[PDB]
Amino acid sequence: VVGGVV
Ligand SMILES: O=C(O)C(F)(F)C(F)(F)F
Ligand SMILES: O=C(O)C(F)(F)C(F)(F)F
């Protein structure tokens, strides 16, 4: 699982 936020 992976996530990213800008
Ligand atoms: O996404 C993975 O690698 C996984 F192991 F299935 C999790 F359980 F972390 F979701
Ligand atoms: O990106 C990588 O090299 C990895 F090892 F999968 C981490 F777990 F750090 F995400």
Residue with tokens 């990213």: 4
Burial class (CB in 10 A: 0-12, 13-18, 19+), 1: exposed
- Report how far ligand 1's centroid is from the alpha carbon of 6 (Å): 23
Record the tokens describing residue 3, joined without a space: 């996530």
Secondary structure of the chain as H, E, C letters: CCCCCC
- Report how far ligand 1's centroid is from the alpha carbon of 2 (Å): 9
Record the tokens describing residue 5, joined without a space: 């936020």
